[PDB]
Write an enzyme that holds these catalytic residues in place. Structure first.
Site, PDB file in Angstrom:
ATOM      1  N   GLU A   4       0.817  -1.143   0.126  1.00 12.38           N
ATOM      2  CA  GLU A   4       0.284  -0.238  -0.110  1.00 12.38           C
ATOM      3  C   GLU A   4       1.397   1.086   0.047  1.00 12.38           C
ATOM      4  O   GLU A   4       2.037   1.371   0.455  1.00 12.38           O
ATOM      5  CB  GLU A   4      -0.697  -0.368   0.697  1.00 12.38           C
ATOM      6  N   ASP A  45       0.041   5.227  -0.026  1.00 12.74           N
ATOM      7  CA  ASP A  45      -0.886   6.033   1.089  1.00 12.74           C
ATOM      8  C   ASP A  45      -0.984   7.774   0.973  1.00 12.74           C
ATOM      9  O   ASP A  45       0.489   7.821   1.939  1.00 12.74           O
ATOM     10  CB  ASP A  45      -1.347   5.996   2.889  1.00 12.74           C
ATOM     11  N   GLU A  98      -3.050  10.590   3.324  1.00 11.03           N
ATOM     12  CA  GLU A  98      -4.506  10.749   4.201  1.00 11.03           C
ATOM     13  C   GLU A  98      -3.812  11.959   4.764  1.00 11.03           C
ATOM     14  O   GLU A  98      -3.198  12.509   5.669  1.00 11.03           O
ATOM     15  CB  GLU A  98      -4.451   9.925   4.908  1.00 11.03           C
ATOM     16  N   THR A 130       2.284  10.548   4.787  1.00 12.53           N
ATOM     17  CA  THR A 130       2.236   9.781   3.378  1.00 12.53           C
ATOM     18  C   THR A 130       2.528   8.526   4.421  1.00 12.53           C
ATOM     19  O   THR A 130       2.972   8.226   5.707  1.00 12.53           O
ATOM     20  CB  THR A 130       3.600   9.993   2.455  1.00 12.53           C
ATOM     21  N   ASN A 131       2.289   7.494   3.384  1.00  9.81           N
ATOM     22  CA  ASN A 131       2.557   5.799   4.568  1.00  9.81           C
ATOM     23  C   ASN A 131       2.838   4.640   3.278  1.00  9.81           C
ATOM     24  O   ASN A 131       2.916   5.154   2.165  1.00  9.81           O
ATOM     25  CB  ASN A 131       2.082   5.463   4.752  1.00  9.81           C
ATOM     26  N   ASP A 161      -0.656  -5.037   7.337  1.00  8.24           N
ATOM     27  CA  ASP A 161      -2.232  -6.019   7.756  1.00  8.24           C
ATOM     28  C   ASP A 161      -2.459  -6.598   9.319  1.00  8.24           C
ATOM     29  O   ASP A 161      -3.146  -6.363   9.887  1.00  8.24           O
ATOM     30  CB  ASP A 161      -2.606  -7.237   7.445  1.00  8.24           C
ATOM     31  N   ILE A 166       1.911  -4.413  12.694  1.00  8.76           N
ATOM     32  CA  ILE A 166       1.687  -2.945  12.295  1.00  8.76           C
ATOM     33  C   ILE A 166       3.032  -2.409  12.049  1.00  8.76           C
ATOM     34  O   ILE A 166       3.189  -2.221  13.469  1.00  8.76           O
ATOM     35  CB  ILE A 166       1.059  -2.092  12.355  1.00  8.76           C
ATOM     36  N   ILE A 167       4.181  -2.250  10.863  1.00  9.89           N
ATOM     37  CA  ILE A 167       4.984  -1.558  10.645  1.00  9.89           C
ATOM     38  C   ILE A 167       4.807  -0.409   9.774  1.00  9.89           C
ATOM     39  O   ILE A 167       4.639  -0.045   8.770  1.00  9.89           O
ATOM     40  CB  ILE A 167       6.174  -2.131  10.596  1.00  9.89           C
ATOM     41  N   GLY A 168       5.448   0.999  11.379  1.00 13.13           N
ATOM     42  CA  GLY A 168       4.452   2.147  10.210  1.00 13.13           C
ATOM     43  C   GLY A 168       5.447   2.708   9.680  1.00 13.13           C
ATOM     44  O   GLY A 168       7.220   2.522   9.689  1.00 13.13           O
ATOM     45  N   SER A 209     -10.198   6.461  15.890  1.00 15.11           N
ATOM     46  CA  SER A 209      -9.626   5.641  16.893  1.00 15.11           C
ATOM     47  C   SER A 209      -7.988   5.863  17.020  1.00 15.11           C
ATOM     48  O   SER A 209      -7.728   7.010  18.051  1.00 15.11           O
ATOM     49  CB  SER A 209      -9.361   4.378  17.003  1.00 15.11           C
ATOM     50  N   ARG A 220      10.711   4.155  18.166  1.00 14.33           N
ATOM     51  CA  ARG A 220      10.633   3.295  17.073  1.00 14.33           C
ATOM     52  C   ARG A 220      11.676   2.175  16.989  1.00 14.33           C
ATOM     53  O   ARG A 220      13.160   2.472  16.540  1.00 14.33           O
ATOM     54  CB  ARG A 220      10.378   3.948  15.423  1.00 14.33           C
TER      55      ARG A 220
END
Length: 274
Positions: A97, A99, A101, A115-116, A124, A127-129, A192, A266
């Site tokens: 993906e 992104d 957003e 942006t991602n 999935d 999650i590793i951002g 959330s 992180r």
């Protein structure tokens, strides 16, 4: 006093690519009654009954994917307006993906553009951002502005008004999206986490929450196009120019508010491209 904005990138990819109407490139994916098309221009909205989302007619192996987008003013906390590439419908549970957003906001706090990038399941379950967040040097609610994702086998570049805001180079196969992707957009309730990590949530007294999209650009190569197909040019000669890089450095110096690679909480061994 003068109008302080980014330096000119000296080349305008969006202007060199034919603008399309929604129906030439996309169809509704879900919430069809919360979408309308007027002479090719798209209006989609969220209210307490439903959001909406759309998907490209074609699947792509590379390209420049853009649109002019206008956001809603006032209280929009919790709601995300999106423009993204994904293949979760093809590789459910272990997808790629890319992104853009727009994270909804409260009056007196500027919108955040996130942006991602997700690769082979990093988005999935565990999650590793790979997030970078900026504010914008204009009010994204007062007019349409150009936004784009440029994606080839060597790089991803995110654009705002033909100014690159981020480049994600291919450093390894494991950290780069290398499979076909469809284009999507949506407006949905992400209460959330969207606004100050969930501090402010959707308040449907302010409904509907509207996203507007026009001047769609698809300078792109479908999966089975001839090998001679090339994505739209991002510069006259290829590769970001010095002028483009300078404009990007200006954005990041003056408007970036989060970068996953810079976050000491992180674990950066999970994101070796940093």
């Amino acid at each position: 006093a003068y109008v302080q904005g980014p330096p000119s990138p000296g080349y305008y990819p969006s202007s060199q690519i034919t603008s399309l109407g929604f129906d030439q490139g996309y169809t509704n994916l879900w919430g069809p009654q919360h979408q309308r098309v007027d002479q090719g221009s798209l209006t989609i909205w969220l209210d307490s009954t439903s959001g909406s989302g759309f998907k490209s007619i074609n699947r792509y192996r590379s390209g420049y994917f853009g649109a002019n987008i206008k956001l809603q003013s006032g209280y929009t906390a919790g709601v995300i307006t999106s423009f993204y590439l994904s293949n979760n419908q093809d590789y459910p549970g272990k997808h790629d993906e890319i992104d853009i957003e727009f994270l909804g906001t409260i009056p007196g706090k500027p919108y955040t553009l996130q942006t991602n990038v997700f690769i082979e399941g990093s988005g999935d379950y565990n999650i590793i951002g790979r997030e970078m967040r900026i504010h914008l040097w204009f009010d994204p609610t007062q007019d349409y502005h150009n936004y784009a994702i440029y994606w080839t086998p060597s790089e991803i570049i995110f654009f705002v008004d033909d100014v690159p805001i981020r480049r994600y180079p291919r450093k390894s196969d494991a950290t780069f999206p290398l499979r076909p992707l469809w284009v999507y957009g949506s407006v949905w309730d992400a209460s959330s986490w969207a606004t100050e990590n969930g501090k402010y949530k959707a308040d449907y007294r302010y409904q509907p929450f509207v996203g507007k999209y026009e001047d769609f650009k698809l300078g792109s190569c479908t999966v089975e196009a001839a090998s001679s197909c090339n994505p739209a040019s991002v510069s006259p000669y290829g590769q970001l120019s010095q002028q483009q890089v300078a404009a990007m450095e200006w954005v990041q110096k003056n408007y970036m508010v989060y970068n996953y690679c810079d976050d000491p909480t992180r674990d950066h061994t999970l994101t070796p491209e940093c």
